[PDB]
Design a protein around this ligand. Sequence first.
Ligand SMILES: [Fe+2]
Length: 312
Amino acid sequence: KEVKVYSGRHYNTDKEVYQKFQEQTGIKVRYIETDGKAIIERLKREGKNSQADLVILVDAAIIENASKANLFQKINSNFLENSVPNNLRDPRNKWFGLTRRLRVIISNPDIVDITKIKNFEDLTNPSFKGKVCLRNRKSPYNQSLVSNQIAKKGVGQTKIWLKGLISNVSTPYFSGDSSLIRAVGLGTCGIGIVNHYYVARMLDGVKGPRDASLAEKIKLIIPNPAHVNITAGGVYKYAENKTEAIKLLEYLASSEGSQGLANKTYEHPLKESSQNRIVSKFGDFTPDNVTIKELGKFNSKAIEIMKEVGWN
Ligand SMILES: [Fe+2]
């Protein structure tokens, strides 16, 4: 028995999670961990000749791209259908959330008055002119944040928010979240928007002592209510080992599997907040109930309006 996993989680291997599954079930896990867009392009080109059984992808936008490319087949699993929150899975049962991340506000309290920052709407405050820094629009994480705003506010109000936000940017757009954390830590930026787990990795020494010292200087603000995004898995449309792929997906979505995956990347498990002491110090959050499917629905529109307002 074997199952082949093509995984977009390539921050640092889930080998340990796959080995636990192998040890428990006798099912050999053969995995590839690489960039999610590379996996999607490879599978579109391979079609029926692909060896993928299970596909794991990061961010609502990439899940939407794989869905549009018909990469997944619908599955029936009483375990997944009764265990994965409705808002974090496909209504059509093609993909299922595994871990949760939050895109949050980071601030340098020496450069900005953090008492005036509670939510994304506060970043349009004119007192922050020249103090806001952003990763570029190519980031699915940012596309999904703008999609989240469209879902909840509609295009008109989201465009007003975007114009206010981009008005406060006077720094070239960043090519990653960790570089933006460094700039906020150093104080060249007063405010950024990054995923919560990058702050936790730097605080925990993962990127070396300079990055840890810079991350210690930041104040992380979880918007209330919070924008939640996910990593998800689904069974490949032509999976040879369909039965084994479902068993592995059931394991990954379970309390043991979701904790195993989340603890490797400093993410939150599916049904509980992280017990990691660094992550728990960031505080409690309340989801805004926008579904992951809705984040995909508005992805194209989010890219359009980001381009229109000069989020470059
Ligand atoms: Fe990431």
